[PDB]
RNA sequence: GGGCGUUAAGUUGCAGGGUAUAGACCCGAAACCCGGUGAUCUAGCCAUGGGCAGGUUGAAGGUUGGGUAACACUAACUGGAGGACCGAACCGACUAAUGUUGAAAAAUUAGCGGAUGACUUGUGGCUGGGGGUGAAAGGCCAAUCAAACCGGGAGAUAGCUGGUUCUCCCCGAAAGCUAUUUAGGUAGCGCCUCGUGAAUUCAUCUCCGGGGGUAGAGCACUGUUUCGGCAAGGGGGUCAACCCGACUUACCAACCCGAUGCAAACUGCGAAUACCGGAGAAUGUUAUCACGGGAGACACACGGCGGGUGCUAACGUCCGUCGUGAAGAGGGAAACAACCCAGACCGCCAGCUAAGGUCCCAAAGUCAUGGUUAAGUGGGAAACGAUGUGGGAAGGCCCAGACAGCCAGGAUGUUGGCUUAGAAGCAGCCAUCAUUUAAAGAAAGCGUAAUAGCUCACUGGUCGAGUCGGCCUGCGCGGAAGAU
RNA sequence: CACAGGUGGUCAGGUAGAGAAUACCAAGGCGCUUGAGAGAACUCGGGUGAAGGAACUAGGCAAAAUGGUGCCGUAACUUC
RNA sequence: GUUUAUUAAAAACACAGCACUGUGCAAACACGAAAGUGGACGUAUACGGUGUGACGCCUGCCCGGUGCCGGAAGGUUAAUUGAUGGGGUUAGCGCAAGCGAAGCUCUUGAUCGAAGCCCCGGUAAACGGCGGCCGUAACUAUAACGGUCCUAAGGUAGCGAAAUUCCUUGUCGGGUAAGUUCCGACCUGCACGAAUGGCGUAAUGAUGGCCAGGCUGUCUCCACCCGAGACUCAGUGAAAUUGAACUCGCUGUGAAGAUGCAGUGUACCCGCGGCAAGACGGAAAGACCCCGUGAACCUUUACUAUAGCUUGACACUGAACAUUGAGCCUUGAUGUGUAGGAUAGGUGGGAGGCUUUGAAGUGUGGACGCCAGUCUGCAUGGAGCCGACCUUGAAAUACCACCCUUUAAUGUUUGAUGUUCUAACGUUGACCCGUAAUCCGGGUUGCGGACAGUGUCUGGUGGGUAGUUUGACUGGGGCGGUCUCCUCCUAAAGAGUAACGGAGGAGCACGAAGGUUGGCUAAUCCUGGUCGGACAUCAGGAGGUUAGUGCAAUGGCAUAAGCCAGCUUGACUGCGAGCGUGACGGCGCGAGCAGGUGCGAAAGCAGGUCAUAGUGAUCCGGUGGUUCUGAAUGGAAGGGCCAUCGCUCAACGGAUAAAAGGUACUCCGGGGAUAACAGGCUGAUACCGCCCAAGAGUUCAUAUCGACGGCGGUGUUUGGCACCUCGAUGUCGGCUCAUCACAUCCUGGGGCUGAAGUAGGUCCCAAGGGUAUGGCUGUUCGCCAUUUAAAGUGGUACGCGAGCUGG
RNA sequence: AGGCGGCCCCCUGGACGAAGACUGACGCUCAGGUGCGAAAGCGUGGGGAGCAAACAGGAUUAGAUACCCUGGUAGUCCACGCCGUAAACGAUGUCGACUUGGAGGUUGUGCCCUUGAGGCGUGGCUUCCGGAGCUAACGCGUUAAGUCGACCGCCUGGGGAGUACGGCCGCAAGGUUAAAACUCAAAUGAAUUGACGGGGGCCCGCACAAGCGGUGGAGCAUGUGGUUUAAUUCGAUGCAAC
RNA sequence: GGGGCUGAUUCUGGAUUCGACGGGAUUUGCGAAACCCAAGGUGCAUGCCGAGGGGCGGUUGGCCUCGUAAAAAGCCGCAAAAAAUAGUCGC
């Protein structure tokens, strides 16, 4: 009984080029989290190790039917997992420069747990212009309408 | 074929046991309802009268004047508004003692608040009970109020309570089953009576006919579990400490073999008793079922016995089976319904006896031979101890002098290096074999800078009868501290 | 009940006081329907107290103490 | 200011000020069934209802629940409404069945029908409602911060250990020598809050809490004195109580704490004044607790009613016009199966009544208009258009018209909104008159008017008003759980046999999963073999009931009662001797026999399932059969018998067609049959002693503690039992006094010591003497101040109310 | 001075000119005082169409408690009261005297034939240029920020702070007067030169759509990034490299 | 403290994250640790004595080598920090 989750501060800050929706594996005593709505995917950024992906810094927060007591840790080095046709070309993408890949939403589809995966670019950045290119459209076609109309 | 009848003499009286409908054995409810009666107190209200002694405080307005151009504002003066103050009569009831079959079925005493107001008050009219009135407390409506009081249906009703009065004689229960808006009541049965009718009927008991699955027992099986052999392969290697790993102890590991367990929901075993059914002797008031009259009771405790619950705790709970209590007096357990003995027809200044007792209170063995106790246990209770004891079976020393006495010897190797601080036995693991054996410890025990030592272990010697220490026992000592 | 009870209106004398309060008095009234005796504990109503002052205790309940006019003097606080 | 007279003056109530809402005056509302009467001889700046209470600053979010307001397209529906239908009567056909015309009937209820409700918005100064969880910052601290789930929406203004805050005496500070109260702040507000109002606030309060001065018998600790009682003498002279008394202490027993019992100790009989521990002292049939199928009031969306309040029907109740509804004078009369001069003939005869029982041209004013056509009318003519068909699963709108999925005029025909009028009625409008009368009647006129208001019926509404249920069981009640039925065990070897004792199940499934006939016979393990895989299909081997029974558990099963295949229906009709089974109701087992089966050839077998669970009394009604009856006769609308339907009536042998709560305003009947305190009885837990040695303590078990475990004691603390007490012993603390125990707090004696001495530790003895004051708190306890030789642990109805305080 | 905006009536302040007569400095400034004083806000009542904070909803939004839309209450309106701050700006206190011009616009007046809208004059207010001269300049510039006089308030760097205490002032909101410790050494007005603008116009270039090709699709030639590496020896590391 | 509710959108039922990871099966080829024999190739050979090793050390008690007595190996410790792009930013 808990709905679509979302970790949407990301998309208008990076790059989003190519998409690709991973599965994952949960290890042991955390599940019922996502299916309560209880969730933590801040800065959440796969670092590529070993060909052996995984997520790092996300808090995934212990239940308490499960006694918070034997239970696994919030963060946790946890290892994702992603087809080896869609897997094992993308290092030649992301291995480059500031890139990482980061996590998008741990939604759940065909009655499944999973996380999506996209390649992003860059913070170091004047983030601006196509932040002003949207006041660059909607004034110029409210001027023109004005222009045209009028 | 069955089921229900024809084997049936019934009515109307009178006495009577019940059941029925009427209050239905009697007294006893809070209330519910129908008529009535009350607003002399009180609750509000209404018309018309009265009361408020004495002091204070000084509002508004008004002047005499400043103030401005008027106003505003302001100075003293007058004027006296107030749910204003202090405090009488009057009200009111806050605090405290007294008084509580007091003086009074709500008050005295001493302090207290309001006291020209939403006041108080005289007298008189109005408001009716599921109604009034209410600064509204469920307070008040005649000392009574979550529906006043007075008659009546009222003999409301009470499945609950206490009482029910003359005598003798007979028999004599139950506290259980089921079912209950049912647990405290009643019904049907089971149990006691009174009458009728009927059979060796039932009852006790020897032999005989049988079905059991309790106790006890047993582990193939449901399931349990300890250990060895058999044990795959393992997280441990002492050793790589990078390795294909030098691998093996207080480790686990199969359906496995051998042994041992336990057990209400385990049984291939299995009584004792209990019960039903036949055959037979005696015996008893036919004690037995069948019908009929009338019950009572359905709240049971203990005590033994096999058991669920509880802590093998209760004068506990809840059932089985039996005795007693109830419903049972008598004796003894000091008294003490249940315990142990025992059934009170009645009288006797009559004998025998059960249980329990036989010094005295007090009725009887100061009896006997044989023991045990020395603790006033007997006269309140143990895990545990012990040269207290009494008995018995041993077992090893025992006169080729041993048991404690009493006297001597008690070591070289070896301070073993160590590791402490010096390490001889001493603070500490090792090997303590052995030189030299009459016999003597790389140390049994102390100590402190180590020490230094010290005895002893273990023998020799002296010395002239029992020991020395384990079991089994009856009796007993301590542990054994409570409130008048 | 010959009961510390309960009810309204009319008149207010002297003397110190603001005054019908209270005090002592007049005119008028009554002296309280059981009385005598002794001077215990104790109860009630009462007076004062060495020294300490709330230690008492639920809490200064009670008691004590203040108390009248004239004049001086009089805070934070306020809707003045 | 004022209230519980007779225990409560307060924080209660009431007030002015405000906010809302109702009310157009015959008000609105209330009492009275009505007449009227208040409101008010007033008129929205007035009155009623409710909410909070001066002013000062303030009064935030939510309309989902709930109510109220408006709105009416649809769903929804009474009273009326009887069209259709459905079943018996009887003229008559029935030779005898059976159909059965009108009439009276009995039944079913299409159709017209308002409010309400469903629905549409609003409104919180209407009832009310106002969240979680998680993450980072400069590691410490939180988190402005993002995350994301639900609601209608997340408590903002101010406040906050408070009159509210348990844990809690939260923390810190001031006040104190010390402060569970107080005062200030702080947030972590279990469970503050904005008109059931928040935070301030001067003034007052017989007010709640607290601190200081001055004061004192309030106190340490009382002393005299002043009086009235109390005491003796004289006079009068009572009550509440009482089974009876020749009425001693202790220990034990005992419906369990003795003035009476058993033992023992002590006591000359009898007064007088005091004291109040005991006679469970005296009063008030215990009010707390609960059983009662007693009782009262009270509430709400508990049950049925019911005053009112509203909605409609008809009557009181009337006429013309606009709109009507079916009707109401004759049939015009429409017509596509892809088929097509294209507007086609239900059964039926097969082709013409016409043609003077008077047909069309052509232009085109209506109309079916997929332009194929047409129902074509008729405005000046004196006359022949169609029929088989051309495509024919269905031949002509060419020839009857009982006249239709389809439609018109002219009059007739009645419901509603319409409108107007007055004659019914209202007039608590005006004026005159009885007359001396503001009522009443009568008249004059004016206004309103078929509304309104009444009656009968009916719908929605409705704690304003009344009647009552609200179950029992229980190791006291409520709370929870349980209640029927099936098997085991408890169940003590026949049957039976308890608990809120132990583990489970069931409210069905099966037209085959039943029937007979013939067969067939298990899991498990190993070997071998294709994708074979850890367990599939196959072959053998062991295996020997360790599998399976449509489901729980037990007892069975191999002749199988399991697993197949073949047949087709005995999962039969009427009976049933004779038994097991319960109190009965009643469920259970059936051999054998009559009818007609099935299976197999036959002897034989089947009245269910391998058995035990899978259900429900009675009434009340509907269906079918029913030569049972049939209120005069003959029928039947109805009643019997037979088959059979509608119950989680589950509290299951069922008090009703349907039923929750509060009482600390309380009331009656009872009981220790059953509670709270106390007594008794256990004694696990508590406490306090002993026992075993891990070890600590430098070496060294016991100077001194002792983890692992043991035995035992007193009868104290928390608990269990329900014996005594419910026609009543009063219960926490403190104030007052003594007494006893001894497991000792000092004083006293001694031992051992990691005891040098001062002092210590810890046991052996010993109860005779002593055993504190303050603050906080009700407190005992507790904390702390500060003493002290020490400030003992306990029992004694947690000593002590016929002696007091009453916090 | 804020402010003042249809039309009419009533009542009324003030200005400016005509040509005189008139009293003779009665004049100027003014701390404190008194009075007015936008809009917002507050109190009492009213009326409340539109508009429209807080408020609700939709979005845009990475977020949006805003800009946009959709609705909508405080208020804006009236009357009577207090408030007494505004960029209450011409950021120019009041009164005077003088110092060259022009172009307007407003209103009043003298004369000439105004035959017609005409001609030159003196007035009054106001706008735009602009000389002398002054200001850092910007600019003002007979209405001065020029030349002088008469008083009057006001500043002594920015923050702190126009804040706190305290007094007055009112119901309040806060108006009213008005410190300090401390802490930087700049804040600051004009101008100029760059650069930039989601500011402007104007212009270019295969930069743009017009059209043609291939890149990016799979392989395959070349290089690089990274991954591996005893090492694969360095550099080229968006635009300007592969 | 007891009593109820919540423990994956199956809730008396049968996962398909097609999701590179750990463990298993099938298809597959040539090295001896996946397997074996001395003929097809071939000489001074095997082992027990005994002895030794990369500026330096270690392991299988042993991997190259050696004949009456001494010189040379694959991997591990001391050390090229063998972090390559480092986590999301400016200083
Ligand atoms: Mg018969
Ligand atoms: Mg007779
Ligand atoms: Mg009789
Ligand atoms: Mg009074
Ligand atoms: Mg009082
Ligand atoms: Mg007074
Ligand atoms: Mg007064
Ligand atoms: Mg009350
Ligand atoms: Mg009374
Ligand atoms: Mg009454
Ligand atoms: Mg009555
Ligand atoms: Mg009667
Ligand atoms: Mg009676
Ligand atoms: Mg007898
Ligand atoms: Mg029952
Ligand atoms: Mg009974
Ligand atoms: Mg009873
Ligand atoms: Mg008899
Ligand atoms: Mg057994
Ligand atoms: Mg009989
Ligand atoms: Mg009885
Ligand atoms: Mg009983
Ligand atoms: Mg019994
Ligand atoms: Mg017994
Ligand atoms: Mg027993
Ligand atoms: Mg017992
Ligand atoms: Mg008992
Ligand atoms: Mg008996
Ligand atoms: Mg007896
Ligand atoms: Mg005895
Ligand atoms: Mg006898
Ligand atoms: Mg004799
Ligand atoms: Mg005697
Ligand atoms: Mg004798
Ligand atoms: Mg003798
Ligand atoms: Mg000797
Ligand atoms: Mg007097
Ligand atoms: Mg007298
Ligand atoms: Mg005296
Ligand atoms: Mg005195
Ligand atoms: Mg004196
Ligand atoms: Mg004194
Ligand atoms: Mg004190
Ligand atoms: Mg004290
Ligand atoms: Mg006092
Ligand atoms: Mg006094
Ligand atoms: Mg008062
Ligand atoms: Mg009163
Ligand atoms: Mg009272
Ligand atoms: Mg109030
Ligand atoms: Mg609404
Ligand atoms: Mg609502
Ligand atoms: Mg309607
Ligand atoms: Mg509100
Ligand atoms: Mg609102
Ligand atoms: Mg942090
Ligand atoms: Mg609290
Ligand atoms: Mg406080
Ligand atoms: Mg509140
Ligand atoms: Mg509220
Ligand atoms: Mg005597
Ligand atoms: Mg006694
Ligand atoms: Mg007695
Ligand atoms: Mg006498
Ligand atoms: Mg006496
Ligand atoms: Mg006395
Ligand atoms: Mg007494
Ligand atoms: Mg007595
Ligand atoms: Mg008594
Ligand atoms: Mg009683
Ligand atoms: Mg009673
Ligand atoms: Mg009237
Ligand atoms: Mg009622
Ligand atoms: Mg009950
Ligand atoms: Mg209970
Ligand atoms: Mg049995
Ligand atoms: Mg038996
Ligand atoms: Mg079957
Ligand atoms: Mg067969
Ligand atoms: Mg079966
Ligand atoms: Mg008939
Ligand atoms: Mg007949
Ligand atoms: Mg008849
Ligand atoms: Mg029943
Ligand atoms: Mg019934
Ligand atoms: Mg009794
Ligand atoms: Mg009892
Ligand atoms: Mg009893
Ligand atoms: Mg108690
Ligand atoms: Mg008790
Ligand atoms: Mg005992
Ligand atoms: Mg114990
Ligand atoms: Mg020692
Ligand atoms: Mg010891
Ligand atoms: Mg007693
Ligand atoms: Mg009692
Ligand atoms: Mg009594
Ligand atoms: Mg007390
Ligand atoms: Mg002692
Ligand atoms: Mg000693
Ligand atoms: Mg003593
Ligand atoms: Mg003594
Ligand atoms: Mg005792
Ligand atoms: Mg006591
Ligand atoms: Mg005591
Ligand atoms: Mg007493
Ligand atoms: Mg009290
Ligand atoms: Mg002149
Ligand atoms: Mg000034
Ligand atoms: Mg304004
Ligand atoms: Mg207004
Ligand atoms: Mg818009
Ligand atoms: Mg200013
Ligand atoms: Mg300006
Ligand atoms: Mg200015
Ligand atoms: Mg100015
Ligand atoms: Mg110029
Ligand atoms: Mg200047
Ligand atoms: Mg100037
Ligand atoms: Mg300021
Ligand atoms: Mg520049
Ligand atoms: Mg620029
Ligand atoms: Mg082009
Ligand atoms: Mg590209
Ligand atoms: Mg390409
Ligand atoms: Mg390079
Ligand atoms: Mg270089
Ligand atoms: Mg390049």
């Known amino acids: 009984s808990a709905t679509i989750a979302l970790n949407k501060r990301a998309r208008h800050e990076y790059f989003i080029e190519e998409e690709f929706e991973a599965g994952l594996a949960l290890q042991g005593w955390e599940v019922k989290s996502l299916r309560a709505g209880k969730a933590n995917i801040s800065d959440s950024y796969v670092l590529l190790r070993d060909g052996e992906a995984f997520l790092f810094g996300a808090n995934i927060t212990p239940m308490a ?45 065909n009655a499944w747990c999973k996380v999506k995966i996209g390649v992003a670019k860059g913070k170091k950045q004047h983030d601006k212009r196509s932040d002003i290119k949207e006041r660059e459209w909607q004034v110029d076609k409210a001027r023109i309408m004005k222009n045209a109309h009028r």
Do not use: F, I, M
């Open 65 to 109: 039917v499960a006694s918070t007591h034997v239970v696994c840790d919030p963060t946790r080095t946890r290892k994702l997992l992603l087809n080896q046709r869609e897997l094992d070309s993308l290092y030649g993408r992301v291995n480059r420069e500031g890139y990482t890949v980061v996590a998008l939403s741990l939604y759940w589809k």
